[PDB]
């Protein structure tokens, strides 16, 4: 399949080179996989989701995304126009309030929720979780992300936006999950992206067009936007049978575009997520 005039980040994850605008992907498109978006919620009724999105848990008075961030992330995972895995099922877990913040105890509860709830969903090709959130180091938050990964979910987490070593942030610093940094359309590390030896991979994170609340769309930037590209890529690859939840981060790193990013500090991977699709 070929989607012309796609958002630059979609075009990038199916290209060996920057500067193209068509997204190429296998038509299976993540069908039979599931991605949990653990964030501010998802505006499920948005047509871009085509009935494939549903809120499954909230820790607040409503399950509505009153912020937009979670809807944007879900759109990069799996919206029809803006998504990597255009046929995946999307499950929203609202651990962040409408101001975009959440207590660590609530975030931990939401991770444990996903580890159990996947047994209530039909995801024959595999389960992914996209965590576009984080704060300072917490061994409890890292442990919860480790449990989620151990349960058989591919966990993708944002490196953080501090232009610093991700070792000091959670869940970014948990070794066993897939920690995602952000790049721009000219293959530079995004100025704000954290770095360090705990990073596994980079994805597109600067000026990312996706869905927003009120049935709308907008471009925004962050490692929060890079993470859902990797989560959607994992879902896509698991539907194709190329990898499993336990192996997907390593598979993505093995098949990544290698050595092509600029402003990568010494000791940080120079790997950019790539779907290796050959039509």
Q: Where are the beta strands (DSSP E) in the chain?
A: 2-3, 23-24, 33-39, 53-58, 89-94, 126-131, 135-136, 153-158, 169-170, 178-183, 201-204, 208-212, 216-220, 257-258, 271-272
Q: Is 69 marked active-site? A: yes
Q: Is the Cβ of residue 143 or residue 219 nearer to Ca ion in the bound state?
A: 143
Q: Is the Cβ of residue 98 or residue 200 nearer to Ca ion in the bound state?
A: 200
Q: At what angle do helices 69-78 and 223-239 cross, to 10 degrees?
A: 30
Please report whether residue 48 would count as binding Ca ion according to CB under 5 A. Answer: no
**Of 60-68, 150-158, 162-170, 195-203: span binding Ca ion (CB under 5 A):** 195-203
C-alpha count within 13 angstroms, C-beta hemisphere, residue 41: 23
Query: Of 43, 65, 165, 200, which one interacts with Ca ion (CB under 5 A)?
Result: 200
Q: Which member of 69, 98, 132, 193 is catalytic? A: 69
Q: How far is the CB of 58 from Ca ion (least distance, A)?
A: 29
Q: How far is the CB of 109 from Ca ion (least distance, A)?
A: 23
DSSP character at residue 119: G
Q: Is 46 marked active-site? A: no
Total number of residues shown for the chain: 279
Taking alpha carbons only, the member of 189, 193, 137 closest to residue 162 is 193
Tokens of 7: 């958002």
Q: What counts of helices (H) and strands (E) characterise the chain?
A: 6, 15
Q: Which member of 39, 98, 165, 184 is catalytic? A: 39
Q: Which member of 14, 173, 224, 229 is catalytic? A: 224
- Residue 16 is labelled as binding a ligand: yes
Please report whether residue 154 would count as binding Ca ion according to CB under 5 A. Answer: no
Taking alpha carbons only, the member of 250, 273, 270, 275 closest to residue 189 is 270
Q: How far is the CB of 152 from Ca ion (least distance, A)?
A: 16
Please report whether residue 43 would count as binding Ca ion according to CB under 5 A. Answer: no
Q: Is 39 marked active-site? A: yes
Residues belonging to the binding site are: 16, 175, 177, 200, 260
Active site residues: 39, 69, 224
Which residues of this protein are in contact with Ca ion, per CB under 5 A?
A: 200
Q: Please give the annotated binding residues for Ca(2+), written as ranges.
A: 16, 175, 177, 200, 260
């Amino acid at each position: 399949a070929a989607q012309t005039n796609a958002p630059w980040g979609l075009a990038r994850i199916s290209s060996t080179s920057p500067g193209t605008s068509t997204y190429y992907y296998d038509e299976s498109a993540g069908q039979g996989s599931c991605v949990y978006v653990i964030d501010t919620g998802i505006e499920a009724s948005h047509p871009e989701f085509e009935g494939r999105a549903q809120m499954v848990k909230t820790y607040y008075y409503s399950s509505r995304d009153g912020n937009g961030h979670g809807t944007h992330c879900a759109g990069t995972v799996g919206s029809r126009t803006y998504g990597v895995a255009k046929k995946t099922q999307l499950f929203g877990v609202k651990v962040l309030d409408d101001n975009g913040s959440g207590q660590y105890s609530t975030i931990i509860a939401g991770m444990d929720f996903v580890a159990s709830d996947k047994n209530n969903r039909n995801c024959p090709k595999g389960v992914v979780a996209s965590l576009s959130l984080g704060g300072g180091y917490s061994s409890s938050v890292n442990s919860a992300a480790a449990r989620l990964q151990s349960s058989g979910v591919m966990v993708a987490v944002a490196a953080g936006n501090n232009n610093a070593d991700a070792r000091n942030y959670s869940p970014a610093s948990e070794p066993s999950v897939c920690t995602v940094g952000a790049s721009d359309r000219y293959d530079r590390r995004s100025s704000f992206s954290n770095y360090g030896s705990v990073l596994d991979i980079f994805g597109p994170g600067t000026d990312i067009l996706s869905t927003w609340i009120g049935g709308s769309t907008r471009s925004i930037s962050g490692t929060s936007m890079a993470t859902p590209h990797v989560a959607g890529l994992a879902a896509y690859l698991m539907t194709l049978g190329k990898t499993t939840a336990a192996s997907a981060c390593r598979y993505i790193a093995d098949t990544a575009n290698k050595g092509d990013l600029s402003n990568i500090p010494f000791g940080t991977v120079n790997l950019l997520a790539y779907n290796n699709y050959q039509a």
